[PDB]
Structure formats: structure tokens, C-alpha cells
Amino acid sequence: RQDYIAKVRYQNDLPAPPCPPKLLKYEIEKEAPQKEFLKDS
Amino acid sequence: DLMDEKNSIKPDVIEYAADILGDVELQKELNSEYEQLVSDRKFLREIVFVNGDHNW
Amino acid sequence: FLEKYVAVCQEENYPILPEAYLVLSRVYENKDLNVALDYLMKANDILGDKANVYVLNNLGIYHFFRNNVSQSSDFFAQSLEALNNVSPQNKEALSITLHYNKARVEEVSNQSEAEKLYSKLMEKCPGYTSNKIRYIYLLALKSNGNNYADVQQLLDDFPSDLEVRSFYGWFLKRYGRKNGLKQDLESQHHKDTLINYDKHDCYALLSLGNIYATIAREMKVTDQKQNEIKRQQYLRAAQFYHKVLSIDPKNIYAAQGIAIIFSDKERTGLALEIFKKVRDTVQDLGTFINLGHCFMEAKQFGKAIESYTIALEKFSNGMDSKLLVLIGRAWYHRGFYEKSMDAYKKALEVSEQAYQLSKLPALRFNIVFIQFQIADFVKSLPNTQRDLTTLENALSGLNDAIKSLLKLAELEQPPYPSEDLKARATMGSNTLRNQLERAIQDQQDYEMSIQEKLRTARRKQQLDE
Amino acid sequence: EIASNERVLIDHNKVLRGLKPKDFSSVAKDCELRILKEK
Amino acid sequence: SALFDDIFTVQTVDNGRYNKVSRIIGISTTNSAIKLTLDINNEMFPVSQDDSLTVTLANSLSLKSWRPPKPTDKSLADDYDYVMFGTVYKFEEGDEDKIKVYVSFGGLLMCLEGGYKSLASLKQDNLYILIRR
């Protein structure tokens, strides 16, 4: 079958890991500061 | 106008556009129609409605 | 409750605690980044000079996710300035984190400073993995995957790290044939990752599904048994994707693999629906290419042309030859199925541009085939539906196509056997060439008759006048 | 301490959601009924 | 199934005289020179400026008296947030590639400007418009 030459290859390639910047937990995200803040007089 | 191509009927609206251009009898008929129209225009514009009112 | 507290404090004219704002932003991180960022801004405004390093870092990350490069950079600079006030105990950790964030921002802006800060942090803390992963990834980008030893060493350093294993598997998928490694080696690595570390990791499951689909596609079909084995491999890949969807139904890549399997199984409608949903979700070059392929399989050649054009303009920027090949094929399909000459002209021009970009035997044969089809279609056309210019162009294209067919037959490994090329050139020259000249003569006779009628009418009109 | 303080905005599975998540539960059901249950 | 598909970004939202009806103007992201002027119901599908809308036009919802839809049956409308049904009352075959399609969804008007290739198939008596956001 001498006709138009074309190659079909589906692209589903996974991207490389992004490694985005990491959020920093608040001081009130730790159990001991939470206890100190809630137990305030 | 059946002689000039760009002043004729569009070819996509009629099936027989091929065998229309260059015909002289059909051009005679069209010329008679146009002369009748021009006579009507003159009669309406110069006798009946001189002020040009066309809604009657 | 936090909104009620905020409202009550506002009604009472009492100072709203910024801790409630931080908690609200933390909650909205998984719901609405906009509301979380707004609450963080309100908390920072309340604090004034009491702004901390974490608040500035989170504001910078919010603006980075919002693509606010200027504002993110300003917030990161303010965080680095405030780092001087950090307690010494956490100072080292927060400095490492802020330097990593700044290196990420540089990698977005300029990779050189990112690599410099990566080396700085690696000397500061060799145990960190993300820094090493990004540095080795940038090196592989610069070295075209010539640092496989570094990737293997990093994999050995953290065999239990999911990020390290995923990066190593990505590098394998990228350059396994370049490195000559085992085809199933990455499959065994991902199988070990799933069995011994985490069986719910969608990355390794998708990699295994892609490997199994590739194996099934490359498998030769000879009888029912081989087709059933291929279907079983596709079923394994589909089970990988279904487990991924069970883990997370919002996985675009699992649906894309499902659509590819359906394309192999000729379930065109489901693949088309999946690809449309994916395009609505995310817009990359692969999605547009797959949409064009599906439209070609769905016989919607115009939509395929549009999809390929959008893919070419948005991402490839008119440089890739494969997209031009696809556009030419779609145009040829449109011209063949719809009997349109302008489609053939556009396909010919696209093929000519692609060849001038590449000058490969495949595109030479494509041009020859297009010209032969053009000549055949023009000969098949009636006189009233064509003109002399198209006939002359078709004849010239036929001559050039015959010459290029001989050229291809003189090549070492032409896309088609040289005997077939020579036979086609001979067949085109023997009969089609003469039929083109006969059509040219008939067209000239038709034009002459038209002009004779036009010149005869005016003389009779003048005589009547 | 770095790991304890580190927080990642989006999860490993949720990274495909980002700011705009979409559901393919119907797609999953159709796949189960037409691939795993395919005859 | 679907006769037209694109993604639009809302430029202007005009409430004007009415309370429950808004005019929105959008241009296709993948292809400029495609415009969409549309009436929508604010209370059911509220929109804001610079929103992204997935607009689809179909001649049928399949996959004469109207009936409330049974929960068991499934149709094309299950994937979208706002479906309207209207009649095409003008198909302006304008300049070289300027085509305008006027559709009236029971008095709520839509005009779609675009090239001939995109809007060739939109020469139907009645059209469904399916909007997702």
C-alpha cells in the first residue's frame, strides 16, 4: 500500500516530579504551642 | 448583463450558469424587462408621486 | 466557627486574633487558595511588624502558585530578611528551607543560580533528597541523560524514597534505549516499589500500565491466542489504571491510558469523550495531538485539522515536522473524501514546508504521492470544474513527482521498495501524463468556444442597434 | 525537624487536581463495566 | 454528536436593565476572531468577569411532548452545569470568512461570530447550548 507516510504514537508520558517549595507550619500548628495558647488565663 | 461575467447572475445560485453567458436572445428579453422597469420608474417619479413618497 | 468569631469581633470592635486567620488559611489550602491567601494577607496586615518567617514564606508560595513571580519574589526576599531574627535552634532548618525555595524560584527564572544554590545546600545538608533530585534532574536536562551513574547512586542512597524512585523511573523511561538497559528492569523496579514500599502509589502503577501497553502493542498478532495475550496485557494495564482511579478518580493520566487502550480496541467514542474531558481539564501538546488522532479515527477531518493547528501554534510553535505531517495527512483525507482541490493544495504546501525544514525521503515520497493524487483528481474533474492553470500545475507536479520517484528508487533504503517506486513512476508517465494533455486540449477547446460565443454576440448586438 | 516543619500544599495523588479538580467517577464506572467486565 | 466546542474567557458582564439576565461577551482562547454574546440566567448560572467557560453546541442530547427527565436515563446534559434549547433564526453567510449565527433561547439571545470552517455545521433549525464551569 504505497500511500502517505505518517506515524501515530499517543503521548501519555508522565512529567518529572515538580518538587515544589514546601510550606512552613505555623507555631500554632504544633501541639505544645496550642496547649500553651488555649490554657491562657 | 449576460455578456460581462462579473456583472451577471452568480453561478452558485443557478444550475444552468454554464450555458447562459453569450446568449443574445435571452439578453434581448432581459433588456426588454429592464426598459419596462425604467419606464415604470420614470412614470412613478415624474407623474404620480413627484415628491418621491414610496409608501402607499 | 472561625467566621462567626471574626464577625462577632468585628461587631464588638475587638482585635481579631491572626491565629484564626492562619487556621482558616490552613483549612482553605485544600479548598480555596484564593481565600487562604486573602486571610493570610489580612493576618499579615493585623501583625504589621509582627510578621513571621512562616507567614512570608506561605505568602510567597501562594503567589508562586498564582504565578505572581514579582510578588512571590518580594515575599521570599522579606522572608530571607526576617531570617536574621529567627531563633538559632530553628535558624539552620529555616535557612535551608528558604534557600531551597529561592533555588526553586531561580530554577523557574534562571537554572544557573538554582544549580549554584543547590550545590550550596547539598554541601550544607547532603542528606536532603529534593535538592539532590532537582540538581541531578537539571544536570540530566543539560547532559541529555548522560549521568545515569548519578541517578543510580541517588537511587541507592534512598531506596525507600518515593520521590527518588519516581525520578529514577522517569529517567529510565526517558533514556532506557539510550543506556541499553533491560526493558523489564524498570518494570521490576516498580513492582518492587509497589509490593515492598507502597501498593497505592499511582506513579509506579501508571508506569507499569504504560510498559504493559507498550509490550502489548509491540506484540505481533497471528491468531486468537496472541490477540488474547495482548488483551490480557491491556487488561493488566487497565487494572493498574483502575486501581489508580480507586486511589484518586481525578487522575487525567489514567483516563488517557484508558482512552489509548480503547483506541487500540477501536472504542473511538469513549476515547473521544475522555480526550475532550482531558482537554477541558488540562491543555498540553499531547492532549491536542491525541484529539487530532481521535478525530482522524472519527472521520472528523476538519476538527482534526483545527486540533493539529492549535497543537502546532501553542506548543511546538511551528517547528516539529510530525505535526506538519499530521496536518498534511488530515488535509489529504479531507480532499479525498470531500473531493476538494484546495485541501490538496494546502496539503501540498504543508508537505513542501515540512520537507524544506527536513529534506527527508519520507517527505519526498509524501510530496510525490500528493502530486500524483492531485493529477489524478484534476484529470477526473470535468472541464467546467477546472481551468488551464490547474492543469498546467498538475502536469508540472506530475513531472517533478516522477523525477523524485526515480530519485527515491535510487536511494539505499527508500520508504517503499524501489521496484514499487519505479513501477508507480512508469504507470504515471505512461497513461496519466497523456490524459493530462488530453484534458488540457479539451479545456483549451472549451475556452475557445466560450470566447467565440462572447465575440459573436457583441457584433450582432451592434448590428441591431 | 525539617520534615516536621515541612508542609506540601498539594498531595501526591492530588497533584493532578491543583486549583481545579475534575471527577472521572463515571469514566471509572464505564471502564469497570466495559473493560474489567468486557465480554 | 456535538456540533461545536471551545473554551471562552468572559470579557464583559452586563446586567443593565434586568435582574435575572446578564449579557456576557467572550472570545475563544484557542482561536481569536471567535466571539460569543449570550444571555444567561444569573440566579441559576452566575458568572463573573475573566471566568473560563466550556461552551458546546449540539443538535441533540442523545448518546415530541416534553416530560420531566427520569433519574434512570442518561443524556449528554449530565456533564454540564447549564443547558439551554433554542431556535436558529439567522445564519449570516457574510464576508469571506465572517459567519454570524443568531440563536434565540425563548427570548434569550446568542450571537456567535467565527470563521466558516468552525461554524459550517451550525446550519440547523434548533440547537442546544451546553455550558460548563
XYZ file of C-alpha atoms in Angstrom:
734
model
C 0.000 0.000 0.000
C 2.062 2.910 -1.353
C 0.382 5.941 0.207
C 1.074 8.837 2.565
C 3.700 8.110 5.213
C 2.682 9.002 8.768
C 3.391 7.533 12.202
C 0.886 7.576 15.073
C 2.183 7.496 18.658
C -0.061 8.575 21.526
C 1.677 10.795 24.091
C 0.824 9.916 27.705
C 4.275 10.412 29.209
C 4.319 11.268 32.904
C 6.090 14.553 33.752
C 9.086 14.700 36.043
C 8.395 15.285 39.763
C 7.917 19.003 40.461
C 9.444 19.205 43.951
C 7.598 22.462 44.750
C 8.588 24.752 47.634
C 7.428 23.403 50.983
C 5.045 25.293 53.237
C 6.224 26.043 56.772
C 3.936 25.009 59.616
C 2.729 27.793 61.877
C 3.720 27.946 65.526
C 0.069 27.157 66.331
C 0.369 24.005 64.203
C 2.408 22.334 66.977
C 0.724 20.630 69.922
C 2.698 22.340 72.698
C 2.095 25.941 71.486
C -1.571 25.017 71.015
C -1.714 23.831 74.623
C 0.019 26.989 75.846
C -2.296 29.280 73.862
C -5.550 27.534 74.803
C -4.638 27.282 78.504
C -4.169 31.065 78.701
C -5.752 32.838 81.666
C -25.704 41.571 -18.099
C -25.142 38.215 -19.800
C -22.013 39.292 -21.708
C -19.815 40.615 -18.897
C -19.064 37.818 -16.448
C -18.701 39.870 -13.257
C -21.955 41.757 -13.979
C -24.045 38.595 -14.429
C -26.054 36.273 -12.215
C -23.890 34.494 -9.668
C -23.083 30.921 -10.766
C -23.760 29.253 -7.400
C -27.437 30.287 -7.356
C -28.449 28.757 -10.721
C -27.832 25.264 -12.068
C -27.592 26.407 -15.705
C -24.950 29.122 -15.269
C -22.706 27.449 -17.860
C -24.935 27.929 -20.922
C -26.148 31.445 -20.073
C -23.202 33.701 -20.920
C -23.036 34.788 -24.547
C -26.721 34.216 -25.325
C -28.238 37.097 -27.279
C -31.978 36.301 -27.337
C -32.065 35.953 -23.561
C -30.194 39.258 -23.367
C -32.921 40.784 -25.550
C -35.539 39.544 -23.087
C -33.592 40.946 -20.134
C -33.198 44.283 -21.915
C -36.949 44.454 -22.506
C -37.542 43.777 -18.808
C -35.094 46.496 -17.780
C -36.632 49.003 -20.189
C -40.048 48.254 -18.707
C -38.614 48.847 -15.232
C -37.052 52.154 -16.295
C -40.344 53.269 -17.833
C -42.126 52.399 -14.583
C -39.552 54.385 -12.608
C -39.996 57.419 -14.858
C -43.799 57.205 -14.741
C -43.899 56.929 -10.950
C -41.230 59.553 -10.329
C -42.360 62.252 -12.776
C -46.170 61.907 -12.887
C -47.757 60.081 -9.961
C -45.506 60.744 -6.939
C -43.454 63.854 -7.677
C -42.258 64.238 -4.076
C -40.813 60.721 -4.042
C -43.022 59.144 -1.379
C -42.935 55.382 -1.912
C -45.031 54.008 0.988
C -48.630 53.717 -0.194
C -16.891 28.861 63.972
C -13.907 30.960 62.886
C -16.104 33.082 60.610
C -18.572 33.553 63.472
C -15.717 34.591 65.778
C -14.463 37.051 63.151
C -17.940 38.541 62.726
C -18.503 38.837 66.486
C -15.131 40.532 66.982
C -15.826 42.953 64.120
C -19.212 43.809 65.641
C -17.572 44.277 69.060
C -14.605 46.283 67.673
C -12.181 43.840 69.301
C -8.791 42.823 67.845
C -9.284 39.769 65.658
C -6.720 37.112 66.516
C -4.476 36.435 63.481
C -4.242 32.799 64.623
C -7.838 32.301 63.484
C -6.795 33.695 60.097
C -3.857 31.275 59.925
C -6.132 28.350 60.802
C -8.637 29.447 58.147
C -5.863 29.706 55.549
C -4.577 26.256 56.522
C -8.076 24.822 56.088
C -8.652 26.622 52.772
C -5.310 25.343 51.431
C -7.189 22.212 50.343
C -10.352 24.108 49.309
C -9.596 27.618 48.017
C -6.110 29.056 47.592
C -7.639 32.489 46.950
C -9.490 32.673 50.277
C -6.485 31.253 52.132
C -4.202 33.868 50.567
C -6.684 36.637 51.399
C -6.872 35.504 55.036
C -3.075 35.302 55.213
C -2.863 38.856 53.866
C -5.371 40.007 56.495
C -3.352 38.302 59.238
C -0.155 39.941 57.971
C -1.866 43.343 57.942
C -3.002 42.803 61.538
C 0.514 41.756 62.564
C 2.238 44.671 60.835
C 5.809 44.454 62.096
C 4.893 41.177 63.850
C 5.109 39.285 60.540
C 6.973 35.988 60.888
C 9.078 33.899 58.520
C 6.363 31.267 58.026
C 3.738 33.845 57.030
C 6.052 35.422 54.445
C 7.081 32.012 53.096
C 3.454 30.923 52.718
C 2.553 34.220 51.025
C 5.433 33.728 48.595
C 4.347 30.155 47.884
C 0.769 31.356 47.332
C 1.938 33.954 44.816
C 4.199 31.365 43.163
C 1.188 29.080 42.724
C -0.684 32.164 41.476
C 2.245 32.770 39.063
C 2.779 36.172 40.719
C 6.524 35.989 40.151
C 7.203 39.550 41.325
C 5.093 39.305 44.485
C 6.395 35.819 45.286
C 9.979 37.046 44.901
C 9.287 40.062 47.124
C 7.735 37.856 49.815
C 10.678 35.442 49.641
C 13.092 38.372 49.963
C 11.179 39.630 53.011
C 11.321 36.115 54.478
C 15.091 35.971 53.948
C 15.428 39.415 55.544
C 13.382 38.274 58.551
C 15.505 35.109 58.785
C 18.058 37.205 60.696
C 15.539 37.362 63.565
C 14.985 33.585 63.728
C 15.892 31.676 66.882
C 19.268 29.900 66.493
C 17.804 26.424 67.087
C 15.493 26.524 64.056
C 17.670 29.009 62.154
C 19.596 26.351 60.216
C 16.467 24.446 59.181
C 14.580 27.584 58.154
C 17.613 28.892 56.246
C 17.841 25.586 54.367
C 14.121 25.743 53.560
C 14.279 29.372 52.395
C 17.372 28.709 50.279
C 15.603 25.731 48.695
C 12.587 27.924 47.915
C 14.823 30.632 46.431
C 16.585 27.978 44.348
C 13.189 26.807 43.075
C 12.294 30.383 42.112
C 15.650 30.678 40.335
C 15.062 27.372 38.526
C 11.864 28.987 37.284
C 13.833 32.108 36.316
C 17.450 31.034 35.670
C 18.770 27.500 36.135
C 22.378 28.570 36.814
C 21.681 30.269 40.149
C 19.353 27.389 41.011
C 22.191 24.905 40.482
C 24.575 27.115 42.472
C 22.200 27.245 45.447
C 21.591 23.509 45.008
C 25.317 22.879 45.428
C 25.395 25.277 48.390
C 22.587 23.427 50.174
C 23.971 19.995 49.260
C 27.256 20.960 50.900
C 25.225 22.403 53.784
C 22.987 19.317 54.086
C 23.846 16.298 51.912
C 21.005 14.270 53.452
C 18.248 16.271 51.764
C 16.667 14.459 48.811
C 14.637 17.076 46.916
C 17.719 19.265 46.441
C 19.711 16.339 45.039
C 16.767 15.218 42.893
C 16.351 18.665 41.338
C 20.103 19.134 40.855
C 20.527 15.760 39.139
C 17.405 16.440 37.057
C 18.832 19.760 35.854
C 22.147 18.050 35.095
C 20.331 15.355 33.100
C 18.499 18.075 31.173
C 21.835 19.756 30.439
C 23.684 16.477 29.790
C 20.831 14.786 27.851
C 20.728 11.928 30.350
C 24.467 11.219 30.374
C 24.608 10.981 34.195
C 22.898 7.608 34.647
C 25.546 6.751 37.252
C 24.418 9.716 39.363
C 20.776 8.613 39.118
C 21.681 5.051 40.119
C 23.745 6.337 43.053
C 20.862 8.550 44.196
C 18.503 5.571 43.959
C 20.920 3.565 46.107
C 21.073 6.403 48.654
C 17.291 6.442 49.235
C 15.728 3.176 48.019
C 12.689 3.856 50.237
C 12.109 7.417 48.987
C 9.100 7.524 46.671
C 10.343 10.732 45.030
C 13.801 9.281 44.337
C 12.305 6.087 42.902
C 9.838 8.033 40.744
C 12.598 10.278 39.385
C 14.783 7.241 38.662
C 11.899 5.551 36.849
C 11.233 8.703 34.834
C 14.905 8.828 33.834
C 14.715 5.147 32.866
C 11.600 5.714 30.757
C 13.395 8.634 29.103
C 16.748 7.014 28.279
C 16.494 3.227 28.613
C 17.180 2.644 24.928
C 19.976 5.226 25.032
C 21.549 3.430 28.008
C 20.747 -0.022 26.615
C 19.207 -1.189 29.884
C 16.722 -4.033 30.221
C 13.199 -3.282 29.028
C 11.682 -5.008 32.072
C 14.230 -3.574 34.537
C 12.037 -0.550 35.257
C 9.075 -2.929 35.457
C 10.825 -4.958 38.167
C 11.825 -1.758 39.984
C 8.226 -0.510 40.032
C 6.946 -3.953 41.042
C 9.344 -3.970 43.997
C 8.257 -0.427 44.874
C 4.591 -1.450 44.854
C 4.969 -4.763 46.701
C 7.501 -3.749 49.352
C 7.008 0.017 49.791
C 3.557 1.214 48.676
C 0.970 -0.603 46.553
C -1.179 2.560 46.344
C 1.393 4.728 44.528
C -0.216 5.894 41.282
C 3.129 6.830 39.692
C 4.521 3.287 39.612
C 1.112 1.878 38.660
C 0.901 4.242 35.678
C 4.475 3.417 34.665
C 3.698 -0.309 34.800
C 0.497 0.217 32.821
C 2.371 2.145 30.136
C 5.038 -0.574 29.965
C 2.409 -3.313 29.650
C 0.517 -1.357 26.983
C 3.751 -0.876 25.027
C 4.521 -4.602 25.292
C 1.020 -5.493 24.089
C 1.185 -3.000 21.209
C 4.581 -4.263 20.035
C 3.371 -7.874 20.296
C 2.736 -9.466 16.909
C -0.796 -10.715 16.220
C -1.012 -14.057 14.415
C -4.077 -15.849 15.808
C -6.701 -15.681 18.550
C -4.233 -16.742 21.257
C -1.806 -13.880 20.612
C -4.647 -11.354 20.458
C -5.947 -12.743 23.762
C -2.487 -12.366 25.326
C -2.357 -8.778 24.050
C -5.818 -8.198 25.528
C -4.626 -9.687 28.831
C -1.668 -7.289 28.930
C -4.044 -4.420 28.166
C -6.276 -5.752 30.955
C -3.330 -5.647 33.362
C -2.653 -2.040 32.363
C -6.358 -1.244 32.753
C -6.339 -2.806 36.228
C -3.371 -0.591 37.110
C -5.339 2.435 35.902
C -8.486 1.293 37.733
C -6.541 0.946 40.979
C -5.160 4.445 40.379
C -8.708 5.743 39.879
C -9.826 3.958 43.049
C -6.993 5.777 44.821
C -7.966 9.009 43.046
C -10.803 9.373 40.495
C -9.351 12.750 39.405
C -6.395 11.207 37.533
C -6.139 12.532 33.977
C -3.329 10.147 33.005
C -5.311 7.044 33.982
C -8.173 8.184 31.746
C -5.674 8.971 28.976
C -4.276 5.447 29.190
C -7.825 4.080 29.159
C -8.536 6.098 26.008
C -5.332 4.829 24.382
C -6.349 1.241 25.168
C -9.789 1.925 23.684
C -8.074 3.317 20.583
C -6.162 0.038 20.338
C -9.523 -1.691 20.902
C -11.277 0.665 18.414
C -13.642 2.094 21.060
C -13.460 5.504 19.420
C -16.396 7.185 21.166
C -15.171 6.554 24.707
C -11.665 7.710 23.776
C -13.103 10.857 22.181
C -15.155 11.659 25.285
C -12.162 11.042 27.559
C -9.882 13.209 25.415
C -12.434 16.035 25.344
C -12.727 15.896 29.135
C -8.924 15.851 29.449
C -8.600 18.888 27.175
C -11.225 20.655 29.278
C -9.099 19.743 32.309
C -5.526 20.316 31.087
C -4.022 21.705 27.873
C -0.719 20.244 26.669
C 0.665 19.242 23.282
C -0.106 15.563 23.842
C -3.795 16.195 24.508
C -4.195 18.147 21.268
C -2.273 15.517 19.293
C -4.445 12.741 20.732
C -7.584 14.752 19.952
C -6.434 15.133 16.357
C -5.696 11.411 16.143
C -9.144 10.566 17.512
C -10.826 12.964 15.075
C -8.917 11.269 12.258
C -10.206 7.942 13.588
C -13.650 9.554 13.968
C -13.506 10.838 10.348
C -13.942 14.436 11.574
C -11.041 15.690 9.500
C -11.809 19.394 9.901
C -11.743 19.174 13.692
C -8.542 17.142 13.407
C -7.027 19.940 11.310
C -8.074 22.505 13.920
C -6.656 20.428 16.781
C -3.349 19.875 14.984
C -3.111 23.581 14.125
C -3.706 24.555 17.756
C -1.120 21.999 18.883
C 1.400 23.395 16.402
C 0.820 27.026 17.378
C 0.550 26.718 21.161
C 3.467 24.407 21.994
C 5.558 23.285 19.008
C 5.474 26.849 17.591
C 5.593 25.543 14.022
C 8.903 23.688 14.390
C 8.060 19.984 14.714
C 7.864 18.070 11.440
C 5.496 15.418 12.827
C 2.665 17.896 13.416
C 3.107 19.215 9.872
C 2.946 15.616 8.621
C -0.289 15.104 10.557
C -1.752 18.330 9.145
C -0.860 17.243 5.619
C -2.411 13.818 6.159
C -5.607 15.377 7.516
C -5.789 17.783 4.573
C -5.285 14.894 2.147
C -8.051 12.927 3.870
C -10.383 15.926 3.615
C -9.584 16.407 -0.065
C -10.022 12.721 -0.874
C -13.282 12.164 0.993
C -14.786 15.541 0.045
C -13.333 15.952 -3.485
C -11.827 19.344 -2.626
C -8.870 20.691 -4.596
C -7.998 23.454 -2.120
C -7.423 20.800 0.541
C -4.927 19.149 -1.810
C -3.207 22.491 -2.422
C -2.889 23.182 1.306
C -1.620 19.648 1.962
C 0.961 20.066 -0.804
C 2.145 23.392 0.611
C 2.383 21.964 4.140
C 4.352 18.960 2.884
C 6.672 21.253 0.926
C 7.328 23.376 4.021
C 7.992 20.274 6.126
C 10.387 18.881 3.509
C 12.244 22.194 3.226
C 12.578 22.022 7.003
C 13.851 18.420 6.875
C 14.553 17.155 3.315
C 13.907 13.500 4.158
C 12.960 10.649 1.786
C 9.665 10.130 3.639
C 8.514 13.684 2.929
C 9.795 13.395 -0.645
C 7.539 10.369 -1.112
C 4.699 12.259 0.580
C 5.093 15.133 -1.897
C 5.187 12.668 -4.800
C 2.034 10.922 -3.571
C 0.240 14.245 -3.110
C 1.193 15.362 -6.623
C 0.085 12.046 -8.144
C -3.262 12.249 -6.337
C -3.611 15.875 -7.461
C -3.009 14.927 -11.094
C -5.456 12.016 -10.891
C -8.159 14.165 -9.277
C -7.672 17.005 -11.770
C -7.912 14.569 -14.684
C -11.070 13.120 -13.121
C -12.560 16.614 -12.819
C -14.814 17.899 -15.615
C -13.813 20.827 -17.795
C -16.358 23.150 -16.165
C -14.892 22.407 -12.713
C -11.259 23.190 -13.596
C -9.087 25.622 -15.547
C -5.903 25.583 -17.610
C -3.733 26.848 -14.744
C -4.634 23.898 -12.512
C -3.959 21.509 -15.400
C -0.508 23.011 -16.006
C 0.331 22.926 -12.294
C -0.788 19.291 -12.086
C 1.329 18.359 -15.114
C 4.416 20.084 -13.695
C 3.846 18.382 -10.351
C 3.497 15.042 -12.130
C 6.829 15.530 -13.906
C 8.569 16.527 -10.671
C 6.917 13.614 -8.854
C 8.180 11.141 -11.458
C 11.694 12.576 -11.154
C 11.547 12.346 -7.360
C 10.201 8.783 -7.601
C 13.266 7.865 -9.647
C 15.436 9.650 -7.071
C 13.828 7.646 -4.252
C 14.264 4.410 -6.215
C 17.968 5.286 -6.474
C 18.260 5.599 -2.677
C 19.704 2.975 -0.340
C 16.671 2.348 1.905
C 13.684 4.229 0.450
C 10.446 4.296 2.476
C 8.931 1.924 -0.106
C 10.714 -0.678 -2.260
C 12.486 0.848 -5.253
C 10.685 -1.537 -7.610
C 7.340 -0.149 -6.432
C 8.589 3.424 -6.861
C 9.793 2.769 -10.412
C 6.576 0.929 -11.297
C 4.449 3.804 -9.995
C 6.529 6.378 -11.877
C 6.211 4.352 -15.086
C 2.453 3.933 -14.605
C 2.027 7.663 -14.031
C 4.127 8.622 -17.048
C 2.593 6.101 -19.467
C -1.117 6.923 -19.122
C -1.779 9.768 -16.671
C 0.635 12.116 -18.453
C -1.152 11.722 -21.802
C -4.598 12.000 -20.206
C -3.486 15.291 -18.650
C -2.563 16.637 -22.096
C -5.906 15.468 -23.498
C -7.684 17.281 -20.663
C -5.600 20.385 -21.404
C -6.624 20.270 -25.067
C -10.296 19.827 -24.151
C -10.091 22.758 -21.720
C -8.485 24.930 -24.401
C -11.256 23.995 -26.840
C -13.886 24.876 -24.226
C -12.281 28.269 -23.556
C -12.052 28.940 -27.298
C -15.747 28.136 -27.742
C -16.628 30.476 -24.867
C -14.597 33.291 -26.407
C -16.127 32.660 -29.835
C -19.638 32.986 -28.405
C -18.695 36.133 -26.486
C -17.177 37.783 -29.560
C -20.073 36.772 -31.822
C -22.797 38.131 -29.518
C -21.498 41.715 -29.430
C -21.329 42.079 -33.214
C -24.978 41.070 -33.600
C -25.952 43.438 -30.786
C -24.186 46.314 -32.553
C -25.890 45.399 -35.834
C -29.286 45.510 -34.120
C -28.510 48.898 -32.559
C 12.915 18.979 62.356
C 12.855 19.913 58.660
C 10.416 17.085 57.917
C 8.210 18.104 60.850
C 8.150 21.758 59.770
C 7.831 20.953 56.055
C 4.331 21.042 54.587
C 3.418 20.404 50.944
C 0.473 22.327 49.509
C -0.794 19.512 47.269
C -0.667 15.755 47.786
C 0.987 13.161 45.556
C -2.369 11.869 44.312
C -3.973 15.335 44.358
C -1.231 16.979 42.259
C -3.365 16.441 39.145
C -6.192 18.392 40.804
C -4.310 21.585 41.644
C -6.557 24.639 41.665
C -9.270 22.988 39.525
C -10.198 19.349 40.185
C -12.484 17.299 37.967
C -14.218 13.971 38.506
C -13.986 10.874 36.305
C -16.113 8.607 38.507
C -18.456 7.996 35.574
C -15.379 7.230 33.465
C -14.206 4.738 36.100
C -17.637 3.081 36.202
C -17.725 2.813 32.402
C -14.210 1.344 32.405
C -15.223 -1.240 35.010
C -18.376 -2.163 33.071
C -16.621 -2.235 29.679
C -13.040 -3.418 30.326
C -12.972 -5.492 33.509
C -16.496 -6.740 32.736
C -15.862 -6.778 28.974
C -17.120 -9.885 27.191
C -22.833 14.321 18.488
C -21.534 17.799 19.342
C -21.508 20.366 16.548
C -19.184 22.937 18.136
C -16.813 23.020 21.093
C -14.497 25.676 22.506
C -13.404 27.442 25.695
C -14.249 31.102 26.236
C -12.996 33.771 28.623
C -15.607 36.287 29.729
C -14.591 39.852 28.910
C -17.664 41.820 29.991
C -20.759 41.039 32.050
C -23.650 43.476 31.613
C -26.650 43.304 33.925
C -28.219 46.554 32.745
C -31.993 46.835 32.866
C -32.715 43.323 34.137
C -32.089 41.497 37.406
C -32.111 37.827 36.379
C -30.444 38.151 32.955
C -26.844 39.025 32.081
C -25.085 39.647 28.772
C -21.644 38.044 28.642
C -19.073 38.546 25.884
C -16.314 36.006 25.380
C -13.514 35.235 22.954
C -12.133 31.771 22.335
C -8.766 31.065 23.922
C -7.594 28.668 21.208
C -8.713 30.936 18.355
C -9.325 34.671 18.349
C -11.876 36.260 15.997
C -14.476 33.915 17.532
C -16.904 35.926 19.653
C -19.816 34.838 21.843
C -22.552 37.203 23.006
C -25.035 35.405 25.227
C -27.941 35.881 27.615
C -27.803 33.757 30.774
C -29.890 33.414 33.909
C -27.960 34.947 36.806
C -29.760 33.067 39.580
C -29.019 29.624 38.110
C -25.615 30.056 36.433
C -23.944 33.145 37.904
C -20.736 34.194 36.163
C -18.001 36.724 36.856
C -15.533 38.609 34.694
C -12.495 36.708 33.377
C -14.159 33.347 34.002
C -13.420 30.366 31.766
C -16.449 28.654 30.225
C -16.583 25.447 28.197
C -19.264 26.046 25.561
C -20.635 23.190 23.461
C -23.348 23.297 20.803
C -25.267 20.153 19.906
C -28.263 19.333 17.742
C -29.417 16.580 20.118
C -28.803 15.483 23.690
C -28.963 11.751 22.957
C -25.968 9.443 23.280
C -42.380 15.153 20.979
C -44.058 16.319 24.171
C -41.532 17.232 26.842
C -41.522 15.169 30.027
C -39.623 15.550 33.292
C -36.434 13.506 32.940
C -36.398 10.171 34.721
C -33.432 9.758 37.099
C -32.557 6.454 35.412
C -31.948 7.779 31.900
C -28.679 9.443 30.920
C -28.116 12.132 28.301
C -25.407 14.497 27.110
C -26.555 17.132 29.613
C -25.230 15.091 32.554
C -21.732 16.537 32.048
C -22.610 20.249 32.092
C -23.910 22.869 34.501
C -26.237 24.893 32.259
C -28.195 23.636 29.239
C -30.479 25.729 27.039
C -32.516 24.947 23.936
C -33.230 27.468 21.207
C -34.014 28.059 17.552
C -31.605 29.437 14.959
C -33.286 32.422 13.323
C -30.402 33.803 11.241
C -27.327 32.298 9.558
C -25.458 35.258 8.063
C -23.205 33.956 5.289
C -21.263 37.190 5.441
C -17.826 38.133 4.137
C -15.001 35.800 3.090
C -14.757 34.128 6.494
C -17.137 36.126 8.726
C -20.129 33.976 9.714
C -22.718 35.039 12.289
C -25.224 32.656 13.858
C -28.150 34.116 15.798
C -29.934 31.787 18.219
C -32.869 32.646 20.486
C -33.431 30.525 23.600
C -37.011 31.593 24.186
C -36.137 35.283 24.047
C -32.614 34.968 25.469
C -30.376 35.795 22.536
C -26.993 34.468 21.433
C -24.735 35.582 18.582
C -21.703 33.551 17.512
C -19.107 35.145 15.231
C -16.454 32.957 13.663
C -14.908 31.523 10.553
C -16.801 29.409 8.056
C -14.864 26.224 8.810
C -15.726 26.274 12.516
C -19.409 27.193 12.152
C -20.263 25.330 8.936
C -22.133 22.568 10.779
C -24.248 25.052 12.770
C -26.839 25.364 9.978
C -29.593 23.653 11.947
C -33.125 24.612 12.905
C -32.644 24.103 16.655
C -29.535 23.975 18.828
C -28.689 23.039 22.395
C -26.002 25.077 24.138
C -24.168 23.349 26.977
C -22.072 25.453 29.351
C -19.654 24.038 31.920
C -17.677 25.802 34.632
